[PDB]
Each structure stands twice: as C-alpha cells, then as structure tokens.
Design brief:
The complex is a heterodimer of chains A (317) and B (7).
Chain A lengths: L6 E7 L3 E8 L8 E6 L5 E5 L1 E2 L9 E5 L2 E5 L2 E2 L2 E2 L3 E5 L2 E4 L10 E2 L2 E5 L2 E10 L9 E3 L9 E11 L4 E3 L15 E5 L2 E9 L2 E10 L5 E4 L13 E4 L4 E8 L5 E9 L4 E5 L12 E4 L4 E5 L18 E5 L1
Parallel strand pairs in A: 5-11
Antiparallel strand pairs in A: 1-2, 2-3, 3-4, 6-7, 7-10, 8-9, 10-11, 12-14, 13-14, 14-16, 15-16, 16-17, 18-19, 19-20, 20-21, 22-23, 23-24, 24-25, 26-27, 27-28
Chain B lengths: L7
The chains are: A mainly beta (317), B little secondary structure (7).
C-alpha cells in the first residue's frame, strides 16, 4: 500500500496522521482517494471518499483544524477555482460561503488563527475589483484566459463561513505564488515565492491580531530565493524550511530553520542532500519530526522529463 | 503545462 507519485498535492496533519490528497504527475491523481500516513508506524492507508468530492486538482490550499480538513482553491483540468470544501475525518462537503470569495487561484498559502482561516496570495484569474489588494498579470499567460499573481488577504470565518478582507497596515509583500506560509501564535509568516521574473528570498509576517505587515531582515546568511518550498512550524520559536526551486531553475535540497527569537537562519544538516524536492509537502509530527512527501526531484517545467516522487523524507529536528 | 504556470 503506497500512494502514487505526485507534486502539487496537499498534506495536512494532526501530529499523528498525515492526510494526503490530489496533485498531478507525468495527469491529475484520482479525486476520490484520500491517503493517510501514520507518522508513528510508517504505514499508509487509502480510503475512498464520497459527498461533494472536489475535482482532481494541483495547487489547492488545505488545513487540518480539530480533525476537520478544509480545502480551498487549486487547478483542475478546466482551470483555477475558488470553491471551498470541508472533510470531517468519508464525506466531502462543498460549503457555499457568504461574502465575496477570493478570486479563483492556486499555489497560495493559509494561516489558521482561532476561528479564522486566512489566505494569502496565489496565481489565477483576474478578480472582480471588489477585492482589495493588488493583482499583476503574468504576461506569458496571454500566449497560453490570462492569469497573474495577487497579494490579497482573505478571511474565511469558520463561525459563519463568511468571507471578508481585513484592512491591513504596513507594507504587504509583493503579489506572489508558490510562497510558503507558516503560523506561530498570532504571526502569519510568509517566505519567498515567485513574482514576475524572480523566485524570492524575502521574509514577512502579518500580525493576525492587529493586521499589521512586518518585513523581517535576518542578520547574516539567508537561504537562496525560491518557490515551491515548504516552511513548517516545529516549535513556538522555529520554522523549518526545505527544498524548492531557484530563479535559475535549480532544484533544492538544503534545509534550514528560522529561529524567530534570534531572527536568524540556521542551515540544517541532513542525509537527503541528493534528494532535492519541489512542490512537495511537509508536516510536523508530535515527536519533533518533519515528514516530507511527494514533489519533484528536477525541473518539473520540462514535463516529459519530470521526476515526481512518492518518497517520504523524515527530518529529525 | 497550466498547473505549474506562475510558480
């Protein structure tokens, strides 16, 4: 029993069980399958789901909150979506939310704070200008509906399933997609991502109480700019970064922790230097490990040469 | 291919 290889899937966790859904490979993986990885025993189980099963998608944005799985956005065979689903862990339910939803998009991030799911950025269609924030077209998408990056922040209030947008202060990060978000306390961190012609190395956080954006400028050596990397809270003071894809299209296998209190990056030694990954997933276990799954070992933009993986990589940190 | 555009 083992899930097929894939990139752009989602993985979420309760610290013990890792739930894996979707993604594509060299196209989309079966929509009705939900793969569960037991972090303690190392075994996989597959279960088939029912209800309002979402279309097979890559680049969806998922979270696990009290064993309830929430899923937003993604890219299916007919384009991007802004649908919102939940799965209480065998039956998917599509939730018809109130308020103005975000624009249809994929490759974004989410912070969880109390009752709120807070989504940021991503890549998709031109919004209705009702949305506030900025959207910038990817000029090359006109040559293959045009799409672009956004820096939007949206709240889905799980108390009422109503969409809204906070008024924020400070300088938001530029629009971006394939960035990584991580939450610690009331701070929603975001690192790197793709915007225009760069895969970036900037680090910000949004205060989830005051809605104030802050840019972090760590002292000393910082990880190379990248997208399609993972960033994972592993303590109340450390974010674990792995892998990704550079501006110059290099697949990455370096691992770092960002120490929040010291505002310092620390490069992490590990046995997987020859196993670079991008568009993988990463989940923190209760025993201090980061469980990496899936993703692609080389440049996935060369589709016929793409090396998608179904390997589990375990980082003990 | 369209799913990986924009990253």
């Amino acid at each position: 029993a083992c899930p097929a290889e894939r990139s752009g899937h989602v993985a979420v966790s309760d610290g013990r069980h890792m739930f894996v859904w979707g993604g594509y490979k060299s196209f989309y993986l079966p929509r009705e399958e939900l793969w569960i990885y037991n972090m303690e025993t190392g075994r996989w189980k597959k279960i088939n789901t029912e209800g309002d099963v979402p279309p097979s998608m890559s680049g969806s944005c998922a979270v696990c909150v009290d064993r309830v799985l929430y899923l937003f956005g993604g890219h299916h065979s007919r384009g991007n979506t802004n649908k919102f689903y939940m799965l209480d862990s065998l039956q998917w339910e599509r939730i018809d939310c109130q308020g103005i939803p975000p624009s249809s998009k994929d490759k974004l991030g989410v912070w969880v704070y109390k009752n709120k799911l807070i989504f940021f950025g991503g890549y998709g269609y031109l919004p209705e200008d009702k949305v506030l924030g900025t959207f910038e077209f990817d000029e090359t998408s006109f040559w293959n509906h045009p799409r672009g990056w956004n820096d939007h922040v949206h709240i889905l209030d799980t108390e009422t399933f109503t969409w809204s947008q906070p008024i924020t202060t400070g300088k938001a990060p530029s629009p971006r997609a394939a960035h990584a978000c991580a939450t610690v306390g009331n701070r929603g961190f975001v690192f790197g991502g793709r915007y225009r012609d760069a895969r970036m190395n900037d680090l910000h956080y949004l205060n989830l109480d005051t809605w104030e954006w802050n840019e972090l400028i760590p002292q000393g050596i910082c990880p190379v700019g990248r997208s399609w990397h993972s960033l994972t809270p592993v303590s109340s003071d450390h974010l674990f970064l792995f892998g990704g894809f550079t501006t110059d299209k290099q697949p990455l296998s370096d691992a770092w922790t960002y120490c929040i209190s010291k505002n310092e990056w620390i490069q992490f030694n590990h046995p997987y230097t020859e196993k670079p990954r991008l568009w993988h997933t990463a989940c923190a276990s209760d025993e201090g490990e980061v469980i990496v799954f899936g993703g692609c070992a080389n440049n996935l933009l060369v589709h016929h040469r793409a090396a998608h993986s179904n390997e589990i990589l375990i980082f003990s940190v | 291919p369209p799913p990986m555009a924009g990253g």
